mmCIF file with all atom_site columns, C-alpha atoms in Angstrom:
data_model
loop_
_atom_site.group_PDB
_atom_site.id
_atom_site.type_symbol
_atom_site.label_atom_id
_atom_site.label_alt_id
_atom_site.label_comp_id
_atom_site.label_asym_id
_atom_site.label_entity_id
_atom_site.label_seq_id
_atom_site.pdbx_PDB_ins_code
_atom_site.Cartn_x
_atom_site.Cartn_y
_atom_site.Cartn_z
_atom_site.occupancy
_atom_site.B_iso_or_equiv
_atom_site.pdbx_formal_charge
_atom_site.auth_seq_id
_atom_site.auth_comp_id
_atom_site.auth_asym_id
_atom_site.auth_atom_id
_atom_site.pdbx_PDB_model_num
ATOM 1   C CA . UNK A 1 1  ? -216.696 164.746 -15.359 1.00 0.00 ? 1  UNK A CA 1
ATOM 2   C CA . UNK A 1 2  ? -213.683 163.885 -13.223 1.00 0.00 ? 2  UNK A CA 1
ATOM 3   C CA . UNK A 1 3  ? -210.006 162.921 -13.662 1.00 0.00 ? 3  UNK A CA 1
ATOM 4   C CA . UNK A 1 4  ? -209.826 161.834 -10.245 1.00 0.00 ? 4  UNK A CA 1
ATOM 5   C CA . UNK A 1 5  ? -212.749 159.068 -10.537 1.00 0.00 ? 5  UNK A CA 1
ATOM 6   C CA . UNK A 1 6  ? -210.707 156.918 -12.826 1.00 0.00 ? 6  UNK A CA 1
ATOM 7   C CA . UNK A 1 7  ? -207.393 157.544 -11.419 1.00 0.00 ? 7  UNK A CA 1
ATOM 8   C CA . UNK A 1 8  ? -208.439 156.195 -8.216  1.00 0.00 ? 8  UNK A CA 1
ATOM 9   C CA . UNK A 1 9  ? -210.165 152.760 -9.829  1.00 0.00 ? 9  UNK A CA 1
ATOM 10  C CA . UNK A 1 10 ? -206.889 152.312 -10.811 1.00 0.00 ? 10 UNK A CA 1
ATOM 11  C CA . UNK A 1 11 ? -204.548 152.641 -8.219  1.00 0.00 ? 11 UNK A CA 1
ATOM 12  C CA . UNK A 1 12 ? -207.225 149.729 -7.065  1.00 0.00 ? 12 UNK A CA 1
ATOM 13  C CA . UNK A 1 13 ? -205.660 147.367 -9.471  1.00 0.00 ? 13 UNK A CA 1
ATOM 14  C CA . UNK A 1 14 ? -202.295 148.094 -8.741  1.00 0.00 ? 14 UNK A CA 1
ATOM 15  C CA . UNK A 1 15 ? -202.897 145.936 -5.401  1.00 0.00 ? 15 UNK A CA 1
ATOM 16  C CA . UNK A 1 16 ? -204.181 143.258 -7.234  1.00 0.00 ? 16 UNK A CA 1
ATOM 17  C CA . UNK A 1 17 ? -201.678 143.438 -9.516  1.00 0.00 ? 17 UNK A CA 1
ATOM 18  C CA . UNK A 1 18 ? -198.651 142.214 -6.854  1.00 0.00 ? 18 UNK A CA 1
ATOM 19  C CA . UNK A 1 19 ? -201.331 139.929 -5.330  1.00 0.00 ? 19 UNK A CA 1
ATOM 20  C CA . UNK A 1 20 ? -201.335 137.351 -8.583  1.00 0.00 ? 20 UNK A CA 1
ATOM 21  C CA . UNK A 1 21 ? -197.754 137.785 -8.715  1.00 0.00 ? 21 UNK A CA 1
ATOM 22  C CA . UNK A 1 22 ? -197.728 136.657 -5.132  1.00 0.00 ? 22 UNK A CA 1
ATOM 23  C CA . UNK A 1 23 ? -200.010 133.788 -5.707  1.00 0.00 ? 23 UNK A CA 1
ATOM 24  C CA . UNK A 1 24 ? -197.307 132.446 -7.547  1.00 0.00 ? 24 UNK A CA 1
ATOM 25  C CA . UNK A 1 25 ? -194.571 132.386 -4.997  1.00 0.00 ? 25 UNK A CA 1
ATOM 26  C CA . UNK A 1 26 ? -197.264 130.910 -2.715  1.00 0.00 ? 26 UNK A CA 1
ATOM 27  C CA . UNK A 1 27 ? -197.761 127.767 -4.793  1.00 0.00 ? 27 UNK A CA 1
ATOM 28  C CA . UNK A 1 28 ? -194.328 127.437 -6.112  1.00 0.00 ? 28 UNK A CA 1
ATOM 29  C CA . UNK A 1 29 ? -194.790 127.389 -10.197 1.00 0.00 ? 29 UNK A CA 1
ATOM 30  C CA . UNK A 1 30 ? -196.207 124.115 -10.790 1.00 0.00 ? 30 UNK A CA 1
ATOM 31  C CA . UNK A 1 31 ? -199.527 124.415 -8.701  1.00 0.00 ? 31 UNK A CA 1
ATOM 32  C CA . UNK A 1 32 ? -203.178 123.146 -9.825  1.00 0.00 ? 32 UNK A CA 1
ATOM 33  C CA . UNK A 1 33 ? -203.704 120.003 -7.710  1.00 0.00 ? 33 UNK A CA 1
ATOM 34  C CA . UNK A 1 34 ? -203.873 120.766 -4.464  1.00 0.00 ? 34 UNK A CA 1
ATOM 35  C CA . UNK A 1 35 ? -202.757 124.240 -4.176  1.00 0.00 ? 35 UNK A CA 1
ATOM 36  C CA . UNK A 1 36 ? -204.875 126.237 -1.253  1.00 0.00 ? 36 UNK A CA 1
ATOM 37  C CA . UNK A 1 37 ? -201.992 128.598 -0.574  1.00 0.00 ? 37 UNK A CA 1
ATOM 38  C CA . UNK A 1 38 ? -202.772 129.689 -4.106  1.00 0.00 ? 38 UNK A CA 1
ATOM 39  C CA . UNK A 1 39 ? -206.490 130.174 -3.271  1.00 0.00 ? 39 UNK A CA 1
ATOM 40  C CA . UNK A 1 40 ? -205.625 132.031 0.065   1.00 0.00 ? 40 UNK A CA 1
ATOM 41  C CA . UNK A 1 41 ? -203.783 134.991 -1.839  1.00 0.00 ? 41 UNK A CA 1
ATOM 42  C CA . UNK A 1 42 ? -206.554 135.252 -5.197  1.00 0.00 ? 42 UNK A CA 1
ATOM 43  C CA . UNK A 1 43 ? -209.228 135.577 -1.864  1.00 0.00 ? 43 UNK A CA 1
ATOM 44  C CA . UNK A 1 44 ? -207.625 139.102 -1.473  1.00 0.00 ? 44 UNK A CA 1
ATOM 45  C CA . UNK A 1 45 ? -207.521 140.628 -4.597  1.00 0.00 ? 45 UNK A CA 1
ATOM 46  C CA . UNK A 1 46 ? -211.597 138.977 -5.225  1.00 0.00 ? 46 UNK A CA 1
ATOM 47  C CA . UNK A 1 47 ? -212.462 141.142 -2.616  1.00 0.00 ? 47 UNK A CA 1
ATOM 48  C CA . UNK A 1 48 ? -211.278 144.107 -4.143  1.00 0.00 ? 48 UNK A CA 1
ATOM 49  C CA . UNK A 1 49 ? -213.569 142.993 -7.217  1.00 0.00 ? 49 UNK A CA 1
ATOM 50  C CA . UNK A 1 50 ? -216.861 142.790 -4.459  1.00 0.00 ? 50 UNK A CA 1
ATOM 51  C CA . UNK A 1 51 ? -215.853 146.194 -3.475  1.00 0.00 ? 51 UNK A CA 1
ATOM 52  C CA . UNK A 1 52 ? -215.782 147.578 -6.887  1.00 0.00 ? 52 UNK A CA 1
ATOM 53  C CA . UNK A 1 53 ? -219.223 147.177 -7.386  1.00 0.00 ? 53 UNK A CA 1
ATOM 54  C CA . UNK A 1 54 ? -220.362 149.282 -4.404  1.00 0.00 ? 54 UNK A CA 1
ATOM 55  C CA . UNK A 1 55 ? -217.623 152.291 -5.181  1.00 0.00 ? 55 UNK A CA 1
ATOM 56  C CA . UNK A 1 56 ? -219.215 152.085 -8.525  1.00 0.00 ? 56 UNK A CA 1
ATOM 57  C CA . UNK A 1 57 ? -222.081 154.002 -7.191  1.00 0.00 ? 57 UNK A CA 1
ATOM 58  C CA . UNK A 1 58 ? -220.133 156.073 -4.910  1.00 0.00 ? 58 UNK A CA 1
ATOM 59  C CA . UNK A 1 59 ? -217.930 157.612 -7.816  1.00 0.00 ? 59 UNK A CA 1
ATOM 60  C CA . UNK A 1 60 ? -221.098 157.552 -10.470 1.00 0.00 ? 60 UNK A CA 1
ATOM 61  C CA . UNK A 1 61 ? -223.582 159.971 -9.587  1.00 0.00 ? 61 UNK A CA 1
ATOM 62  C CA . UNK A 1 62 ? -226.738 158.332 -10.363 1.00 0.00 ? 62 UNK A CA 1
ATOM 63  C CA . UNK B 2 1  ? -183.387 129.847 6.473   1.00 0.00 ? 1  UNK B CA 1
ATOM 64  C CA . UNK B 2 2  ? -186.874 130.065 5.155   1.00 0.00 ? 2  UNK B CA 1
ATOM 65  C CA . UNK B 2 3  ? -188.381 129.022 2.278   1.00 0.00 ? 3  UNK B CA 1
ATOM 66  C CA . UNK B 2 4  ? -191.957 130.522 1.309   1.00 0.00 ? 4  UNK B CA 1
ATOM 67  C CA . UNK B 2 5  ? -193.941 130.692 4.262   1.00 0.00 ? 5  UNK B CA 1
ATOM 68  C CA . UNK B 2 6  ? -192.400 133.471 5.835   1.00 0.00 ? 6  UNK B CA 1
ATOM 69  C CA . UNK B 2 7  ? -191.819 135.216 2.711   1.00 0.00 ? 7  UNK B CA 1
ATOM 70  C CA . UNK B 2 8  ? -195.177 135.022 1.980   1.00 0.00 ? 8  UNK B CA 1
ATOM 71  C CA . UNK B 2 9  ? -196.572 137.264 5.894   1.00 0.00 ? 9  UNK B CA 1
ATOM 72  C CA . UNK B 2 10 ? -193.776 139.450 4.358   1.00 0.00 ? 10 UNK B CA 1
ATOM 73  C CA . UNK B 2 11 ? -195.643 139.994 0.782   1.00 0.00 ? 11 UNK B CA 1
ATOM 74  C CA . UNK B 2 12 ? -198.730 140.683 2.618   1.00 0.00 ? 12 UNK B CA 1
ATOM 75  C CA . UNK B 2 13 ? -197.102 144.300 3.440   1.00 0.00 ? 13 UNK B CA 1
ATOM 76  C CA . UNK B 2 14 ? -196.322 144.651 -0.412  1.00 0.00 ? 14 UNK B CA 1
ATOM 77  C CA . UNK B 2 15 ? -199.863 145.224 -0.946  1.00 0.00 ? 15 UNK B CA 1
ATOM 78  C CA . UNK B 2 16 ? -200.811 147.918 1.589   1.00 0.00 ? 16 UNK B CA 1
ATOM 79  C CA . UNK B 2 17 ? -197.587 149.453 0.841   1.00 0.00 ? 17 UNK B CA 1
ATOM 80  C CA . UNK B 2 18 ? -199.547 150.505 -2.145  1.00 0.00 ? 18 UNK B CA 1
ATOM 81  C CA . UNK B 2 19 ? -202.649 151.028 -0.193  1.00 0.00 ? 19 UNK B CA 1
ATOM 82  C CA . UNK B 2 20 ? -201.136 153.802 1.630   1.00 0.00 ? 20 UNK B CA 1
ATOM 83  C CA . UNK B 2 21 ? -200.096 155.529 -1.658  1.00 0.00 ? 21 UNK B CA 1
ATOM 84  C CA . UNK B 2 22 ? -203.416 155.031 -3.311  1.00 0.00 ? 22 UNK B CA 1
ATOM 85  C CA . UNK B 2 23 ? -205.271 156.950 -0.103  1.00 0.00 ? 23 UNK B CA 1
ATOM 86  C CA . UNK B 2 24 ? -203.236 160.158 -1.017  1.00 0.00 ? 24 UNK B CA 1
ATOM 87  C CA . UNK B 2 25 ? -204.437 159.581 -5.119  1.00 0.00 ? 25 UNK B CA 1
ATOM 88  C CA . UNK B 2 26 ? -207.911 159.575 -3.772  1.00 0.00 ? 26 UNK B CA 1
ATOM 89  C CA . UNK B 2 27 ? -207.879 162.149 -1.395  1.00 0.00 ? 27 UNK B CA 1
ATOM 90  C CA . UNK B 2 28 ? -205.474 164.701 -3.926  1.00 0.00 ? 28 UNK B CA 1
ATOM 91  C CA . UNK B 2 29 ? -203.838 166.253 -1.156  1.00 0.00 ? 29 UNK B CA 1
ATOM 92  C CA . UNK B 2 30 ? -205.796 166.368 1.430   1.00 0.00 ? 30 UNK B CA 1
ATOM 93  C CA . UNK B 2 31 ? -209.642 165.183 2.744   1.00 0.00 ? 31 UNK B CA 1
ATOM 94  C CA . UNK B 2 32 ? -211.501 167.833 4.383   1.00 0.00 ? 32 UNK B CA 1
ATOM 95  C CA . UNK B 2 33 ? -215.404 167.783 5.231   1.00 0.00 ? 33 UNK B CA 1
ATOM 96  C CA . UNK B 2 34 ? -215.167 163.752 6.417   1.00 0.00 ? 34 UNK B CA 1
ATOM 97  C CA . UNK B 2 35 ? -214.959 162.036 3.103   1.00 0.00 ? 35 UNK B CA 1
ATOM 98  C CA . UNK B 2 36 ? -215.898 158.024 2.845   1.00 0.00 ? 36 UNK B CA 1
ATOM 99  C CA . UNK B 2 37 ? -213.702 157.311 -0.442  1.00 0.00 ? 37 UNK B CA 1
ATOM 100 C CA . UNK B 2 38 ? -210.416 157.770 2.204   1.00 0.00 ? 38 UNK B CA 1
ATOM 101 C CA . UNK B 2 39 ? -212.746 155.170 4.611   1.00 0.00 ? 39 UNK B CA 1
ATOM 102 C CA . UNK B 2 40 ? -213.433 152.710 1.970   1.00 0.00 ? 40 UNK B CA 1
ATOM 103 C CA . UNK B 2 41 ? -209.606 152.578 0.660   1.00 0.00 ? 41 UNK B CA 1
ATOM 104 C CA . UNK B 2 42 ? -208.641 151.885 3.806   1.00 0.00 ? 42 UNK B CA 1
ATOM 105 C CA . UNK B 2 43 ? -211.419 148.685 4.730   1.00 0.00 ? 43 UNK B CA 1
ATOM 106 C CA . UNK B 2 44 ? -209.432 146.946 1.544   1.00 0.00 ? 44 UNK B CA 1
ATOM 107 C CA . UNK B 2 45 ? -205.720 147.360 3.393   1.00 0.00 ? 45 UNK B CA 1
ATOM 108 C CA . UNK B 2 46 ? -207.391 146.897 6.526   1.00 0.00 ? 46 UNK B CA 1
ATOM 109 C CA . UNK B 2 47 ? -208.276 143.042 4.942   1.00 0.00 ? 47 UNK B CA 1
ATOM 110 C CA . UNK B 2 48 ? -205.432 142.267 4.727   1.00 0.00 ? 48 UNK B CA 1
ATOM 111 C CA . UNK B 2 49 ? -204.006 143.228 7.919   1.00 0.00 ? 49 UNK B CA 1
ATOM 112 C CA . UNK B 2 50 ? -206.735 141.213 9.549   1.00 0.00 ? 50 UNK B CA 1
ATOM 113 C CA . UNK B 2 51 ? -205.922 137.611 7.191   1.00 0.00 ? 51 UNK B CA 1
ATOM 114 C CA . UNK B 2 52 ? -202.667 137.814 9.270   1.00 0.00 ? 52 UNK B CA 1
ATOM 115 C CA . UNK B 2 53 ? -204.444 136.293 12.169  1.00 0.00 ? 53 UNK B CA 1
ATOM 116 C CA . UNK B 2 54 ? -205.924 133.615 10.405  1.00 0.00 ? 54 UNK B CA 1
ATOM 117 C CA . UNK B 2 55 ? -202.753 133.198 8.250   1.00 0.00 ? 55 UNK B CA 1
ATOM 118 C CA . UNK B 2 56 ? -200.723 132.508 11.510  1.00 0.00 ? 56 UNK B CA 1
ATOM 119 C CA . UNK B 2 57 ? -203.186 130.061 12.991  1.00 0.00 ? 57 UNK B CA 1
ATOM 120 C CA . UNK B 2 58 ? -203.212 128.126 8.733   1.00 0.00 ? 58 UNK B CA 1
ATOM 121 C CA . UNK B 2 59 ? -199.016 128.382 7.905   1.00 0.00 ? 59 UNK B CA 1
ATOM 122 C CA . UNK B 2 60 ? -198.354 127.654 11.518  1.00 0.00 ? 60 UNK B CA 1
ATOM 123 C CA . UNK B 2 61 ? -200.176 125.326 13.558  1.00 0.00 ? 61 UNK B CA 1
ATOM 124 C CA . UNK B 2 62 ? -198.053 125.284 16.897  1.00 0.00 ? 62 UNK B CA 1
#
């Protein structure tokens, strides 16, 4: 019963959303063998996906 | 002068850039009476903030 509960969930993508962008620049374009500067960057947005499971409880009364 | 690795520290502040703006979505103006949600969008920028230690120590050895 909220506008603000939604909203908020997805301003939490918009982070992620310049993070896989990044990952790109970080491997170059033609990554897949051994690309760990690809892995470093996807580590950051996969923790705002952990996170997301606790706030789900925080923003939906039980 | 650089190439990637620097311009990659440099994206990191892309991200909270956002984080900052989010905090103000969240909070609609203003907390008041505490308030965790402001907490817990900060711990996610605060992440990333903390990689840059362990991001200088990976991207340059020294």
């Amino acid at each position: 019963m909220k506008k603000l509960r939604e909203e908020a969930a997805k301003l939490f993508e918009e982070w992620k959303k310049l993070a896989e962008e990044a990952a790109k620049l970080l491997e170059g374009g033609g990554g897949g063998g051994g690309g760990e500067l690809m892995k470093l960057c996807e580590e950051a947005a996969k923790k705002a996906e952990e996170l997301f499971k606790l706030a789900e409880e925080r923003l939906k009364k039980l």
